[PDB]
Amino acid sequence: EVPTFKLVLVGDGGTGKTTFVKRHLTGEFEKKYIATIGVEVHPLSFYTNFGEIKFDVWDTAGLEKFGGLRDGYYINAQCAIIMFDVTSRITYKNVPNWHRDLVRVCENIPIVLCGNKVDVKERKVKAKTITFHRKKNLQYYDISAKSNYNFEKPFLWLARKLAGNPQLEFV
Amino acid sequence: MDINELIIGAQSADKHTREVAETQLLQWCDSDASQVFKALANVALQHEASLESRQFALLSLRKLITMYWSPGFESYRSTSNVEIDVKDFIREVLLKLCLNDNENTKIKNGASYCIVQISAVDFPDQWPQLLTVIYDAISHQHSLNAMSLLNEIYDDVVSEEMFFEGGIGLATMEIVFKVLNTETSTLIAKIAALKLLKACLLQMSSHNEYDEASRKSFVSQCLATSLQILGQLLTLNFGNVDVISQLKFKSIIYENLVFIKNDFSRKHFSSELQKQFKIMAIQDLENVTHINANEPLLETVHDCSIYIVEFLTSVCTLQFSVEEMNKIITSLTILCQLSSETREIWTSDFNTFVSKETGLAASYNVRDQANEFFTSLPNPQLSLIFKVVSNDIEHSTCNYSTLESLLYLLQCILLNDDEITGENIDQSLQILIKTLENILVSQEIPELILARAILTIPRVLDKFIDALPDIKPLTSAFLAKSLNLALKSDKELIKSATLIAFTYYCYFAELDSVLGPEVCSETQEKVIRIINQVSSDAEEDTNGALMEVLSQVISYNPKEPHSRKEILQAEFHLVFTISSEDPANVQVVVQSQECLEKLLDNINMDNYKNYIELCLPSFINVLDSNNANNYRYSPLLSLVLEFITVFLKKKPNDGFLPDEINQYLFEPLAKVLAFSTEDETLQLATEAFSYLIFNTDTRAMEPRLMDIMKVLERLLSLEVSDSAAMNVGPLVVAIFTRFSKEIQPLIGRILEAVVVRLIKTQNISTEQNLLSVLCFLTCNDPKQTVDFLSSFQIDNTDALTLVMRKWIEAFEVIRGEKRIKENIVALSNLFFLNDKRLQKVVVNGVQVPLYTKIIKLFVSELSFQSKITGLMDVKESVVQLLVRFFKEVASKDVSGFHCIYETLSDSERKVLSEAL
Numbered sequence A: 001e002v003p004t005f006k007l008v009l010v011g012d013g014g015t016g017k018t019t020f021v022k023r024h025l026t027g028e029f030e031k032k033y034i035a036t037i038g039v040e041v042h043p044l045s046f047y048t049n050f051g052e053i054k055f056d057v058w059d060t061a062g063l064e065k066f067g068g069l070r071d072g073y074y075i076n077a078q079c080a081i082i083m084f085d086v087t088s089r090i091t092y093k094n095v096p097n098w099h100r101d102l103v104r105v106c107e108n109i110p111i112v113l114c115g116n117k118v119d120v121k122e123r124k125v126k127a128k129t130i131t132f133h134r135k136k137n138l139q140y141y142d143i144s145a146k147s148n149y150n151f152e153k154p155f156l157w158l159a160r161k162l163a164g165n166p167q168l169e170f171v
Numbered sequence B: 001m002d003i004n005e006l007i008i009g010a011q012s013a014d015k016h017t018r019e020v021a022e023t024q025l026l027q028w029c030d031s032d033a034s035q036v037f038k039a040l041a042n043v044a045l046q047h048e049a050s051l052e053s054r055q056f057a058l059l060s061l062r063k064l065i066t067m068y069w070s071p072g073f074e075s076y077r078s079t080s081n082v083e084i085d086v087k088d089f090i091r092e093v094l095l096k097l098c099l100n101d102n103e104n105t106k107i108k109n110g111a112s113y114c115i116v117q118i119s120a121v122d123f124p125d126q127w128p129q130l131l132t133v134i135y136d137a138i139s140h141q142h143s144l145n146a147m148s149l150l151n152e153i154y155d156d157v158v159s160e161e162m163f164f165e166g167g168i169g170l171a172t173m174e175i176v177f178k179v180l181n182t183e184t185s186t187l188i189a190k191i192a193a194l195k196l197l198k199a200c201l202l203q204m205s206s207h208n209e210y211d212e213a214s215r216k217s218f219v220s221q222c223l224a225t226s227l228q229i230l231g232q233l234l235t236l237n238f239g240n241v242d243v244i245s246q247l248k249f250k251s252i253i254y255e256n257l258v259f260i261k262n263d264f265s266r267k268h269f270s271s272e273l274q275k276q277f278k279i280m281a282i283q284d285l286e287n288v289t290h291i292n293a294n295e296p297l298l299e300t301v302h303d304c305s306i307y308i309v310e311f312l313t314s315v316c317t318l319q320f321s322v323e324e325m326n327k328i329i330t331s332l333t334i335l336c337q338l339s340s341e342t343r344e345i346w347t348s349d350f351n352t353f354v355s356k357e358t359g360l361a362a363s364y365n366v367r368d369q370a371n372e373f374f375t376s377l378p379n380p381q382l383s384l385i386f387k388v389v390s391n392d393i394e395h396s397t398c399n400y401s402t403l404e405s406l407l408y409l410l411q412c413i414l415l416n417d418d419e420i421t422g423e424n425i426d427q428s429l430q431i432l433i434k435t436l437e438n439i440l441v442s443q444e445i446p447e448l449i450l451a452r453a454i455l456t457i458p459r460v461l462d463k464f465i466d467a468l469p470d471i472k473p474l475t476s477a478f479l480a481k482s483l484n485l486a487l488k489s490d491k492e493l494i495k496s497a498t499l500i501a502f503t504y505y506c507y508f509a510e511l512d513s514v515l516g517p518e519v520c521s522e523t524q525e526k527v528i529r530i531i532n533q534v535s536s537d538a539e540e541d542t543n544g545a546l547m548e549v550l551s552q553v554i555s556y557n558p559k560e561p562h563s564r565k566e567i568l569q570a571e572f573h574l575v576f577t578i579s580s581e582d583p584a585n586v587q588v589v590v591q592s593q594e595c596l597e598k599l600l601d602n603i604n605m606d607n608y609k610n611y612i613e614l615c616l617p618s619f620i621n622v623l624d625s626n627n628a629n630n631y632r633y634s635p636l637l638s639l640v641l642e643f644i645t646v647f648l649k650k651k652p653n654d655g656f657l658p659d660e661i662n663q664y665l666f667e668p669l670a671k672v673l674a675f676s677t678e679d680e681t682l683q684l685a686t687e688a689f690s691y692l693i694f695n696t697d698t699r700a701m702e703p704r705l706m707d708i709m710k711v712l713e714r715l716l717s718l719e720v721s722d723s724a725a726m727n728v729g730p731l732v733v734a735i736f737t738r739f740s741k742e743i744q745p746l747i748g749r750i751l752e753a754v755v756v757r758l759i760k761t762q763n764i765s766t767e768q769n770l771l772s773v774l775c776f777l778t779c780n781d782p783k784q785t786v787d788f789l790s791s792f793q794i795d796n797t798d799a800l801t802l803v804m805r806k807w808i809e810a811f812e813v814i815r816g817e818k819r820i821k822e823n824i825v826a827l828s829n830l831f832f833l834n835d836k837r838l839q840k841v842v843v844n845g846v847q848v849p850l851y852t853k854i855i856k857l858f859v860s861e862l863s864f865q866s867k868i869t870g871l872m873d874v875k876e877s878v879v880q881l882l883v884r885f886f887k888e889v890a891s892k893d894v895s896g897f898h899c900i901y902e903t904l905s906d907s908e909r910k911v912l913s914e915a916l
């Protein structure tokens, strides 16, 4: 009876997808970059004024040497988040490939573009991040895992787009 | 062995089944790839199989091709088993799937991806059948599946060497032209052909500054043919029964034209064609605006209009006829009108309005493209079109359905850098300002029209500041009205519009000189009241705009003998509250830093006492409330520390900091340095504490020496990270510069702590910081430092030899002149001691005397220079240090230097002799 939505996390290594998912799952934040092999499936539960939304996040590996059968995971997905570190402009430059591979396997799904770790130093990609989403109708959010700047916004937007009720809000 | 079982298990969410399924798949395919590839192709071709399984089969075949196809891949795995008999089969399977119109889009996409992966190595020379089948299907059957396949092929794998020297370019261009020229081809086929044209243009544009006539002629001919064909297509017409497809057709046509115009040399795109396509694009705006009167339809209308306006922006350098200009305005008014969904969103949530108007919104409507269009216009066209938009505004004062869009176009025109001048604008601008005043004065006006009036008036005044003789009274009246209409209404959107208008007034007018001190004070009070009312519901980067407006307000803070204390207290209350709410927003943080700096530029030791009691108790409460969590990382804690450090750093130059601030800050700063562990928290707290020590009065700090020393010992003890320990330098510098007499009994503890942390730490930057600290210690008192280092032992071994080894190794690693100078002066001071107990230690990096290696390294530095610690800044170049060192040496302090020079290479001795 409880609705469930499959979420695939994509983005290069070092963009803090695992820290973001772990923060949502437990509230702890782990400081040491450990590589991810394959994918980890984590059930996230968000309470709302209109019942429960329960995403099943697929934390896909961001390293090509570890991305074994990575495209095999996007099948029958219902939403996706493209993560990139604003500290590494190459990751933003590689974001279009992530969007291409996402829309190939599951087209027209709601996809959120998330610039992780705005807190580190100063933005190295500045406002260029607006250029990609403005055409493909993604929504860009500055988020972080060291500080909870916007950590709930991507899931809130995905819940609004999937449940069809823009007035839904997390509590 | 059952491929279906593997492809079912691999999709399972549970870790165990997925990993074992993938391991079995890889082991099977490494054992015999020919069977696995054939099975995957079969289950991809079996229409009876579930779509998820077919798509997983194709996406797994894509990966297996990357590993076992053939050498030349950067990840090709040895001992493949894919004989040509399997490749020929699966190529046929893929080129059957990728163009079977009955197949679902996902399977076609997977097949095209696999074909692209194969073509990354096998194309074109190994697989001409691919190109033969694509060209056959496109030219004879107009199969848009094959056109999409070719378009994706050009995206990933085709390169300019294949495009120009190979047959790809000419053949593709001929096929595309043949498809476009024939009227029989369906509109969707034309769209696919134009997408192929766009890909070919991108191929021609990626390389530039060509140097081969074989390419230039081909490019020029293809450009001429493509422009002729696009003109013919734009001259073609449709029955308007498939308007969404016509909108996509026009959208891709103008995308091609904007690409040609913006990314190719002007030579190939004649100005006559510019003038023709200008008229064509204007007629297409008219057509799209008529079509719009008929939700996905509106979206495609806006998408097509964006590209048409982009083309007009590129052409904009051309002259626009008055009737063409009027058509452009009449179309942009219909196109720039706010959708009912956006009107509802702005009415219900002013935060989206603030995000959009501040330019931080994650969107790009037709309105932004119109802004770009009017911004790019040249001065004559801008001056003509301003009259048109002003006349349309004047005639449409009662037409509230469109007036908002007219005000937006007027704003966009006034954003243009060029100064609008013309024959009779003076009459026009008077009518315009009277209309805006009537809009402000009127009642029952829709809130969005009023909000557009409020933001347009500052642009009107700014653009025509050189033409209005009554600019001061008009600015005063309009500002007063904008503030009154925000105070006297409950629509927070209007309040946000008013504060944005206020920051636009601040960016052009010196309000503090035109309004007068009393009017300026009253406007500051009104704006802070508005900000206070708005802050109760701020979100989504509304706080950043509030902070910017507050910065502009405090930038007009009156002189100290006249400033109102209550206004300043409210200003600080706002800059604190708005930044404490949503503290993680980096923009809010930096703007609050700038606001505090602006609020503390006008301080003195008299009023600084009043500033202490206002500011400090707010920070002390947060420091106390963070004590329970052991001062762990938190955005609010870092924020209050970054405010404390700014308040300290903005010291009154008249003299030392008052004892009051020291008595306030010492206890919580000591506690956070003694208990915290987060790197950022320790760094900020050390930055504050060191400055407090450096600028505290000597007689006030003397009783607290033991506490300071204990804090330093903890801050460099092992239970804190080395990166946080990096900041130890400034604290020791402040201690020595402050306690210049009391440090004598306890200096041994400092040396012990520095040397122990130096020998423990691995981190390079931490090693450098401890080396700087030890350098400062040695330069202050070389005798005590050497006595302690030689006498004290760690792990039953004297510290001296280990620290010499690490010091010389790090100096050999150290870079940057600033750090080199400190080591230069330290080693020279050690040399000038002339005590045998140092120089008799043997060191190697051949074993040589310690002083000998010191002078050898100094020589090596002099050879290098021949061509940020700042703890010993003297602002003197390394060259004069070197020459004074060698001249003191040549003054024969110790005779060993001559023996070493004769031992050293003749070239080095010659370099020394030529340097001095």
Ligand SMILES: Nc1nc2c(ncn2[C@@H]2O[C@H](COP(=O)(O)OP(=O)(O)OP(=O)(O)O)[C@@H](O)[C@H]2O)c(=O)[nH]1
Pocket: A011, A012, A013, A014, A015, A016, A017, A018, A019, A020, A029, A030, A031, A032, A033, A034, A035, A036, A037, A059, A060, A061, A062, A063, A116, A117, A118, A119, A120, A143, A144, A145, A146, A147
């Ligand atoms: N400063 C800062 N560091 C962060 C933030 N989020 C994560 N990190 C750190 O950056 C690294 C991110 O690690 P992961 O979450 O595994 O990164 P990833 O790209 O998802 O890694 P893979 O899953 O292996 O591809 C870790 O060292 C985190 O502690 C953040 O918001 N700010």
Ligand SMILES: [Mg+2]
Pocket: A014, A017, A018, A034, A035, A036
């Ligand atoms: Mg990871």
